[PDB]
Design a protein around this ligand. Sequence first.
Ligand SMILES: Nc1ncnc2c1ncn2[C@@H]1O[C@@H]2COP(=O)(O)O[C@H]2[C@H]1O
Ligand SMILES: Nc1ncnc2c1ncn2[C@@H]1O[C@@H]2COP(=O)(O)O[C@H]2[C@H]1O
Ligand SMILES: Nc1ncnc2c1ncn2[C@@H]1O[C@@H]2COP(=O)(O)O[C@H]2[C@H]1O
Lengths: 225, 225
Amino acid sequence: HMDEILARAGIFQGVEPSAIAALTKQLQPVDFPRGHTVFAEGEPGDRLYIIISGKVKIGRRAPDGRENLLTIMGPSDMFGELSIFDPGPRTSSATTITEVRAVSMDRDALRSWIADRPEISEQLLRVLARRLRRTNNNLADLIFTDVPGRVAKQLLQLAQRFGTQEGGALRVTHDLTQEEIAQLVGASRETVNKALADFAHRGWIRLEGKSVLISDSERLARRAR
Amino acid sequence: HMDEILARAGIFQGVEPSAIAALTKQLQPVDFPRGHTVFAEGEPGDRLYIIISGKVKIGRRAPDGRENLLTIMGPSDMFGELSIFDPGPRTSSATTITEVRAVSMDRDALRSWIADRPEISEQLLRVLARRLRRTNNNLADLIFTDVPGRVAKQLLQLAQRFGTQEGGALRVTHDLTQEEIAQLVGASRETVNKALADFAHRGWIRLEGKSVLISDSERLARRAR
DNA sequence: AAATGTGATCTAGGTCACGTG
DNA sequence: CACGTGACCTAGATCACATC
Ligand SMILES: Nc1ncnc2c1ncn2[C@@H]1O[C@@H]2COP(=O)(O)O[C@H]2[C@H]1O
Ligand SMILES: Nc1ncnc2c1ncn2[C@@H]1O[C@@H]2COP(=O)(O)O[C@H]2[C@H]1O
Ligand SMILES: Nc1ncnc2c1ncn2[C@@H]1O[C@@H]2COP(=O)(O)O[C@H]2[C@H]1O
């Protein structure tokens, strides 16, 4: 049902899924509207959430007031755990793109599950490990890849994660306004659209509201390169 | 000498200082010249290193032949662990700007220490956590702060770490060529020099060889923000 | 009816070219 | 082989609209 998702939460991953099943239960869920601010920077938190449905964007804002988005999280993705490992104010903020079902847990609860099963620590370090990896890849493309090739690279990220295969090519219902993709890519609203214009101009992809159909993933991949 | 550092080291805040003195002992040191590629991208690794002296620079290169530097590490700084927690090729290369004395340790060796002492896993997660946090700050500044602002930010991030207190102001012997600062900042060699020019021009800092005597940290800071 | 398209400018900064100790 | 500092020249933000 929904332990189907949590099973793929990293932290469980492996770990006596018979355990997982009993544990979910202590855990109780929370529901959020589209656009709810789960938490914001500066505000202190000792609570981490695993997403069950919907999508959450992580972000930051400079004092000038411009935001960028770190990442898009979706089912089975867990977030807001840095202030669980390094206690302190949130460094970012979590808002909703959709209706979200999320399970929530605090720090004192976590150390319990970690105390009972070591292997979870193994797997958290693996998540963080992978996670920083993913982030260095980005900090790199900010430096090298141009706004176009980046938009192209993003579409791939999203497609893979949130993708589905319908007919002969895959579907991506990103649920992002282009404004969001822009700040998820570090660029201006407009200059990304044009990247997309051309992207669709070559018949590489089809734009359909908050989603996209992608015809030539080979060409798109090639271009982001 | 060798041991004063380890306590200041990361894996093991605390800890059981009784342990550190002995465990430090099994680890065998190894030395490297100024410019030794400890490891490079693609090549496998199961070994993480704590620096005991000198400085190593992490960074990447595109197929184009450009390259950027993720970070500069010094004494008591761990690196090369990501392929320990998240097994897989190196995502970066570690090179020396110095003569570096570093202690080395593999994955299996690490699981031992973890299995004996748990706290270590809490402390590793704290490290990574702090790291992703500091990385994000950087991804942000690529996006928003201008090259001059970043160079002035970096100079601080160096002082804070490899800095000392000479007379009334602080000395930083970065041991970096400007080309390196550039790529540590994600800008060209030249546009970084002139940034420095103006910085020193305003008497904010004095440049001598591979170091810098900072006069007005208040100005530089404001300036970088 | 806020989300989009798309052009007409402006500018930071990259690329060159070439100096210097 | 590290710095210095110019004289251009592309990428892209900014603004200015117009369409759903
Ligand atoms: N660059 C990033 N990539 C992925 N997740 C992040 C990133 N930055 C912050 N987060 C998550 O967002 C959370 C914000 O609050 P925390 O600091 O408690 O924990 C943070 C992480 O779980
Ligand atoms: N790995 C990196 N490669 C290139 N530039 C970086 C890197 N990390 C940080 N920077 C930039 O250099 C700036 C120095 O100051 P900050 O770290 O606060 O903000 C930093 C980023 O804008
Ligand atoms: N953003 C970063 N800042 C500082 N050090 C890093 C960063 N990213 C990776 N590293 C270190 O560089 C190492 C490269 O090899 P590993 O991936 O095995 O482990 C990595 C980390 O220890």
